[PDB]
Amino acid sequence: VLSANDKSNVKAVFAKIGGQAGDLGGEALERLFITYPQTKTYFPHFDLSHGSAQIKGHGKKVAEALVEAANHIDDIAGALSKLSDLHAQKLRVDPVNFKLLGHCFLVVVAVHFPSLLTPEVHASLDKFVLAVGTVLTAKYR
Amino acid sequence: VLSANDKSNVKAVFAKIGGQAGDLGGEALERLFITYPQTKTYFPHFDLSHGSAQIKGHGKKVAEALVEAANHIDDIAGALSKLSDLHAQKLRVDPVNFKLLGHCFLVVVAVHFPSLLTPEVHASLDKFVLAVGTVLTAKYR
Amino acid sequence: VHWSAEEKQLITSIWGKVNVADCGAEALARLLIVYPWTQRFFSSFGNLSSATAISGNPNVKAHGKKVLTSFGDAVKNLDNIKGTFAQLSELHCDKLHVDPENFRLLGDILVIILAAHFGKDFTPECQAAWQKLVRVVAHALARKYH
Amino acid sequence: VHWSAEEKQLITSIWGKVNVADCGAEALARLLIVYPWTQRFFSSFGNLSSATAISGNPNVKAHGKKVLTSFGDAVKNLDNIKGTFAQLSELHCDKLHVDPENFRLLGDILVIILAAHFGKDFTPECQAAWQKLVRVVAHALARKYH
Ligand code: HEM
Ligand code: HEM
Ligand code: HEM
Ligand code: HEM
């Protein structure tokens, strides 16, 4: 579970990464389709070619719910009410596909924002994204 | 998450398996050490030889917290307050070692109580033991 | 990759007593219900929006018989699970993209389902012997990366 | 088990720029903190009850250098990861009993730690190439069952 310092290190970081989203949330999905092609099965409607307006733009959407999900660090289930259904009942996204995205999100922050993500911050950030998906799988687990 | 019918099928079953605990909770640990020797590393203080007073008796303890954990189906974190620390901070039990036990628990009920554990009941039971451990790992996740 | 003597005799002294039909739908109907992000690969299977239907579809019915019919190919040929499910190692990878965990998950459904069909005659050792057989038929498929 | 041309050139055009010492404790200090049920195997390592200490122990310090020194044995010999970590496949199984998941977990710590040490010069393709290298050094050890 997140305690204050979890919830607060996960704030600290999101107070810096406020700058960029279609620049940072967007780089973790290009990292997802490249390292894990397989997850391209969820997007036949999409173009996945290096650079497109879909991974830029749906990219910019994924940061938001993680940014939003950070603003409501105590009640995230409700703060991601629609999303958890659209992912768990409708699209039916295999559980593991979250850890990879979650982990994909860590890389991009390790890319651009090194000297924030210290080991402890790493932990918090992990527990967070790692419970962001939990609340997205809610419907099946 | 558990909805009513989850919480109620998980009652139904525990209203039958009330009969046996040092007879049923005890058979899922003999199943654990035999299928997964490795988990014998947590018990150097124990005798694990087919039949002993330790796996009978610590066995009888594990059912209880699962029986207790069933009686408080809404607030299980508190209902297993001590345990989650003694397992997560002290002994430091590898997360996966729960699913195996959890799964070990399913077998024994599939052993003795077939025509309860229907597919749906299986699901509920799964979600339950599968969230009993979650609340036991709480401290690390 | 090694098979101790009593193991072989045990996975068969309990294999040939399996009703490949009845425990066929059972392993599959259970896997669609208790792990429903898996129904995503069976959209071409018809109406699967209820246990009653997941238990009861004809397509699911006779895909099960096939899936468990694939474990009899593990049992008879206990030294060469490589070669047997090598073509299914591909189809469960390059064609569909089914995450290793899922296999290991059907694996347990299966070790649960006979533990219900055989009662006391399915003993801890016997379970030690099958949940092991799972982890290898499970792995034979897990190869097209490695 | 196959290594496409640009992959080899890439896991090394970035390997030799690794400070085996500094990114050594880093992968390990991170793995003890963010996965602390793992500290259980390092009780013979001294006081590990704080990040400050998990970062700062001498024993952890010079076990790291060793652990990452084990990945240079993957890089140079990219066709034979079988043979290299075959003795470590045992010691990470029959001796200690470390669940496969844990490896895969150190694996990610490691793919995170250079993504911090190399910034923009560690690109998605490059990541595609290492997180892959993880999954194989990760698997070489995962064998004493299979
Ligand atoms: C960090 C965890 C995740 C977050 C925060 C997230 C966020 C979002 C958001 C904000 C949407 C847009 C909803 C809309 O406007 O309709 C969405 C949809 C979607 N997500 Fe995720 N998601 C996550 C995990 C995943 C994973 C793991 C996958 C699978 C690999 C996935 C695949 C999809 C797909 C296919 C859509 C629908 C796209 C479309 O039809 O336009 N998501 N997600
Ligand atoms: C269904 C999940 C579990 C339940 C309900 C459970 C229940 C319990 C209970 C009731 C105790 C006794 C506390 C006491 O009297 O001091 C205990 C202790 C213990 N448990 Fe578990 N446990 C679970 C999972 C696990 C797992 C997965 C492992 C590792 C394989 C494990 C290993 C231990 C050990 C080593 C002790 C201390 C024994 C002793 O020192 O006497 N438990 N657990
Ligand atoms: C791990 C044990 C498994 C075994 C032994 C197994 C075996 C088989 C067999 C015998 C077939 C028939 C192919 C043919 O006759 O052409 C098949 C195909 C298939 N399998 Fe599996 N399978 C396993 C696990 C899984 C899992 C975990 C999934 C998904 C989560 C899955 C999904 C499928 C699908 C969708 C097909 C194609 C059937 C169709 O055309 O609709 N299988 N497999
Ligand atoms: C997956 C990547 C890993 C690699 C490449 C690796 C490599 C190594 C190396 C080089 C040694 C030194 C043995 C010697 O010189 O005698 C070692 C031993 C050891 N490893 Fe790992 N290892 C990995 C993962 C892990 C994991 C996941 C754990 C536990 C969760 C672990 C725990 C240990 C322990 C406790 C030792 C013995 C050190 C001692 O004596 O205290 N390793 N491994």
UniProtKB/Swiss-Prot annotation, chains A, B:
One Gene Ontology cellular component: hemoglobin complex
Superkingdom as given in the UniProt entry: Eukaryota
UniProt-listed InterPro entries: Globin, Globin-like_sf, Globin/Proto, Hemoglobin_a-typ, Hemoglobin_oxygen_transport, Hemoglobin_pi
Keyword list, A-Z: Heme, Iron, Metal-binding, Oxygen transport, Transport
The keyword Transport belongs to this UniProt entry's keyword annotation: yes
GO molecular function: haptoglobin binding; heme binding; iron ion binding; organic acid binding; oxygen binding; oxygen carrier activity; peroxidase activity
Domain Globin: 1-141
Record PROSITE patterns: GLOBIN
Expressing tissues: Red blood cells.
Repressor listed as a keyword: no
UniProt-listed GO biological process terms: hydrogen peroxide catabolic process
Signal peptide (from-to): none
Binding site for heme b: 87
Annotated residues for binding of O2: 58
Known partners and oligomeric status: Heterotetramer of two alpha chains and two beta chains.
Function: Involved in oxygen transport from the lung to the various peripheral tissues.
Protein name in the entry: Hemoglobin subunit alpha-A
UniProtKB/Swiss-Prot annotation, chains C, D:
Pfam families: Globin
Annotated GO CC locations: blood microparticle; haptoglobin-hemoglobin complex; hemoglobin complex
BP term (GO), one: hydrogen peroxide catabolic process
Alphabetized UniProt keyword annotations: Heme, Iron, Metal-binding, Oxygen transport, Transport
Record: residues binding heme b: 63, 92
Keyword flag Signal: no
Organs and tissues of expression: Red blood cells.
GO molecular function terms noted in the UniProt entry: haptoglobin binding; heme binding; metal ion binding; organic acid binding; oxygen binding; oxygen carrier activity; peroxidase activity
Ranges for domain Globin: 2-146
Tree of life domain: Eukaryota
Subunit structure: Heterotetramer of two alpha chains and two beta chains.
PANTHER family: HEMOGLOBIN FAMILY MEMBER, HEMOGLOBIN SUBUNIT EPSILON
The protein's role, per its UniProt record: Involved in oxygen transport from the lung to the various peripheral tissues.
Family: Belongs to the globin family.
The name this protein goes by in its record: Hemoglobin subunit beta
